[PDB]
Every structure is written in structure tokens, then in C-alpha cells.
Amino acid sequence: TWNFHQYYTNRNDGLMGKLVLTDEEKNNLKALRKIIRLRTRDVFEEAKGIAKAVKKSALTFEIIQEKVSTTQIKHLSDSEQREVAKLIYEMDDDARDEFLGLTPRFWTQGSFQYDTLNRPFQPGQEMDIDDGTYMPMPIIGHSLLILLVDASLKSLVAENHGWKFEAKQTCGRIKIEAEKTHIDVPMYAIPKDEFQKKQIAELDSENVNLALREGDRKWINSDPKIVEDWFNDSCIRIGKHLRKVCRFMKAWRDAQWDVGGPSSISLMAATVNILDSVAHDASDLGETMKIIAKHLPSEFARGVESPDSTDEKPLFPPSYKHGPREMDIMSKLERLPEILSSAESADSKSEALKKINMAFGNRVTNSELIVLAKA
Ligand SMILES: [Mg+2]
């Protein structure tokens, strides 16, 4: 019978040592995010410069266009530039007024904010950085904001070799395969007055709207602060070990799937439900990971519901809604406890390391992190 606590938690050779990024990596991602923010704000200032020239000495559309083709918005297709120029021209005094006072704001979400960003494992796997841009509007164009953020990202891509722009449904994305990193930029709309009033010092989820790229619906009520709050709360409530086991389950997914698998947020939600309803010992994360693995299939089978009550879709669908994908996820889920149990009862440290590395991959190599269990 073996103990795997050091295998999991050691910050040098242990799994945690292999997943957490160094302060340098962490700062390179902050620098990249700062770059994206600066360019977004700059492109908005250029566009607003044009619009301000429109409010002032009213100019012709063909002139507006000529000015637009000189700003970083020149990194859009000639048709998109046409769209931008148009929307800026067709603007009424009011919309233009509101627009000239709009300055985009930013707030990061996902792993990087939760502090659960794992070093990518298999080739193709990358670091996900979601940095949302919030537009303080009342209650302006959807297309105009989408085009301005798009123009910011494409303008940054036109400056760097190996960078790519991908237009996804809930965001515009910048990929950097060579650096194994990618940054999504979802756009939200928030109430202006409440934003200013709170600034002179939390908004209301009911008024935080996520813009959708295509479809009949161009906005949906979605606040990331809900999930962030929920996880932070669950972290204080459960303990410092929740983030660790969440990182471990995510690493497990990253090791069992080169691409795909259950979302990290479903694994997190389930893991928190388990740690909330089952007794465990934080001074032994191997035992805890065994409990978690043991209760995960039963959690994913019943279905995992988002900690956001406004979310109508679940993080993971229940059993009677499972297709090949969810059945595959249930296959691996049900295969993990057998691996931890097998590894626990190995015949040597090296074989225990071999068996336990069947779940998280060959990342931990030091077999001395595994030790005999005390009576
Ligand atoms: Mg993302």
C-alpha cells in the first residue's frame, strides 16, 4: 500500500510542480493580455476620432471611409472597412454621442483568473486566456463593436509572425501555436450608469450581455463573475486543496484526450459537489483524489449543472441524453478509479509510478515522491 501525496503536491518534481507555470510564463501571458487591451483601446480611440470629426464638421461617407482606411481598422477586409465607415456615417447624433463616451474596459476570466491554468501536455494543447472586453452602454451597434475588436486583433496579428486570428462564436481569438498559447476576447455589454456609480468607489448579472457573432440572437445574458465568484467561494469554503485537485483533474483530462473531453468547468463543478458532500482528508491528496475519482462517474451520469442558475444548459448532460462523446467521457471517468486503485496496490515505487502515470501521463518522473503508507 502506497502514499501519493508528494507525487501530487511537490512544487518541484510533483504533479503540481509540473502543472503550475513559472512567474516568467505568468508574466508573458500578462504582457500579451496587456498588449491586446492597449490595441483595443487605441482602435476605439481612432474610430472615435473619426466619429468626432463627423459630429463636428459633418463629412461625406466617402471621406469617412478615406479616414477609416488610414486607421488600424485598415486591417479588415475592404468590405468590413466599408461596413465600419457606413455604420459610423449612419449614426444619429445620439448614438454617436454615446459612442464618443464609450471606452472599452477589461476583465480576465477562466483558469488564469481562477489560478488553475495548467501547463499544456500533449502537442496541440494550449494555454487558454480569456480576457473579456466590457462595453459600458445604456439600457450602439453590435456589428460595430464586433468589427472594432476584430480590427484590434487582426491589427495585432499583422504585426507578428506565427500569430493567427480565428473568429469564433462567443469571441475573437488570437492563436500562437509556436508558443502553445491562445487568447480569446469575448465582448460584453454592461449598464453605463451602474458602471460609473460603482466605479466611484459588483454589477448586476441580469444586465451583463455576451455578444454572439452569428445567429438570430446577438446578445445573451451571461456573467463570468458568477462562476468566478462561485469557484472562489467554494475555494474558501472547501480549502486550499480544491484548486489543486481541480488542476489534477484537468491534467487528467489533458492526458486522456489530445483534444476534447469534458469541459474543465464541469470537472470543477463536479469536484466541488463531491468535496462538499463527501468527507475527505486534505493532508492526503492521493486519498482525496481517490474519493473524487470514485464519485465522479455518478456525478457526470446524473448531469452537471452550471453554478449559474441563469444558465439553461448544463455543463454536462445526464445519462439519457448521452451520445458517443458523453459515453466516451463516462468510459474514461469510470476507468480512472481503477487506475488509482491499481496504482495504490502496486509492488514497487516504480510500478506505482508507472500505474499512476497511466492517468496523468509521464510528467512526474521521480518515483521517490511515492512512499510506503504508515500503519
Ligand atoms: Mg477560452
UniProtKB/Swiss-Prot annotation:
<dbReference type="Pfam" id="PF21654">
    <property type="entry name" value="DncV-like_NTFase"/>
</dbReference>
<feature type="binding site">
    <location>
        <position position="184"/>
    </location>
    <ligand>
        <name>Mg(2+)</name>
    </ligand>
</feature>
<dbReference type="GO" id="GO:0052621">
    <property type="term" value="F:diguanylate cyclase activity"/>
</dbReference>
<dbReference type="InterPro" id="IPR048445">
    <property type="entry name" value="DncV-like_NTFase"/>
</dbReference>
<dbReference type="GO" id="GO:0009190">
    <property type="term" value="P:cyclic nucleotide biosynthetic process"/>
</dbReference>
<comment type="function">
    <text>Catalyzes the synthesis of 3',3'-cyclic GMP-AMP (cGAMP), a second messenger in cell signal transduction, from GTP and ATP in response to phage infection. Also able to produce c-di-AMP and c-di-GMP from ATP and GTP, respectively; however, cGAMP is the dominant molecule produced by DncV in vivo, contrary to the 2'3'-cGAMP produced by eukaryotes. Is required for efficient V.cholerae intestinal colonization, and down-regulates the colonization-influencing process of chemotaxis. Is not active with dATP, TTP, UTP or CTP.</text>
</comment>
<feature type="binding site">
    <location>
        <position position="264"/>
    </location>
    <ligand>
        <name>GTP</name>
    </ligand>
</feature>
<dbReference type="GO" id="GO:0046872">
    <property type="term" value="F:metal ion binding"/>
</dbReference>
<comment type="similarity">
    <text>Belongs to the CD-NTase family. A01 subfamily.</text>
</comment>
<feature type="binding site">
    <location>
        <position position="311"/>
    </location>
    <ligand>
        <name>GTP</name>
    </ligand>
</feature>
<keyword id="KW-0808">Transferase</keyword>
<keyword id="KW-0547">Nucleotide-binding</keyword>
<feature type="binding site">
    <location>
        <position position="222"/>
    </location>
    <ligand>
        <name>ATP</name>
    </ligand>
</feature>
<keyword id="KW-0548">Nucleotidyltransferase</keyword>
<dbReference type="InterPro" id="IPR047805">
    <property type="entry name" value="GAMP_synthase"/>
</dbReference>
<dbReference type="GO" id="GO:0005524">
    <property type="term" value="F:ATP binding"/>
</dbReference>
<keyword id="KW-0051">Antiviral defense</keyword>
<keyword id="KW-1017">Isopeptide bond</keyword>
<protein>
    <recommendedName>
        <fullName>Cyclic GMP-AMP synthase</fullName>
        <ecNumber>2.7.7.-</ecNumber>
    </recommendedName>
</protein>
<feature type="binding site">
    <location>
        <position position="173"/>
    </location>
    <ligand>
        <name>ATP</name>
    </ligand>
</feature>
<comment type="function">
    <text>Cyclic nucleotide synthase (second messenger synthase) of a CBASS antivirus system. CBASS (cyclic oligonucleotide-based antiphage signaling system) provides immunity against bacteriophages. The CD-NTase protein (DncV, this protein) synthesizes cyclic nucleotides in response to infection; these serve as specific second messenger signals. The signals activate a diverse range of effectors, leading to bacterial cell death and thus abortive phage infection. A type II-A(GA) CBASS system.</text>
</comment>
<dbReference type="Pfam" id="PF21713">
    <property type="entry name" value="DncV_C"/>
</dbReference>
<dbReference type="InterPro" id="IPR048446">
    <property type="entry name" value="DncV_C"/>
</dbReference>
<dbReference type="GO" id="GO:0051607">
    <property type="term" value="P:defense response to virus"/>
</dbReference>
<keyword id="KW-0067">ATP-binding</keyword>
<keyword id="KW-0342">GTP-binding</keyword>
<feature type="region of interest" description="Disordered">
    <location>
        <begin position="302"/>
        <end position="321"/>
    </location>
</feature>
<feature type="binding site">
    <location>
        <position position="128"/>
    </location>
    <ligand>
        <name>Mg(2+)</name>
    </ligand>
</feature>
<feature type="binding site">
    <location>
        <begin position="109"/>
        <end position="114"/>
    </location>
    <ligand>
        <name>GTP</name>
    </ligand>
</feature>
<feature type="binding site">
    <location>
        <position position="130"/>
    </location>
    <ligand>
        <name>Mg(2+)</name>
    </ligand>
</feature>
<keyword id="KW-0479">Metal-binding</keyword>
<dbReference type="GO" id="GO:0140701">
    <property type="term" value="F:3',3'-cyclic GMP-AMP synthase activity"/>
</dbReference>
<dbReference type="GO" id="GO:0050922">
    <property type="term" value="P:negative regulation of chemotaxis"/>
</dbReference>
<keyword id="KW-0460">Magnesium</keyword>
<feature type="binding site">
    <location>
        <position position="250"/>
    </location>
    <ligand>
        <name>GTP</name>
    </ligand>
</feature>
<comment type="subunit">
    <text>Monomer. Interacts with Cap2 in the presence and absence of phage T2. A Cap2 dimer is bound on either side by a DncV monomer.</text>
</comment>
<dbReference type="GO" id="GO:0005525">
    <property type="term" value="F:GTP binding"/>
</dbReference>
<keyword id="KW-0843">Virulence</keyword>
<keyword id="KW-0546">Nucleotide metabolism</keyword>
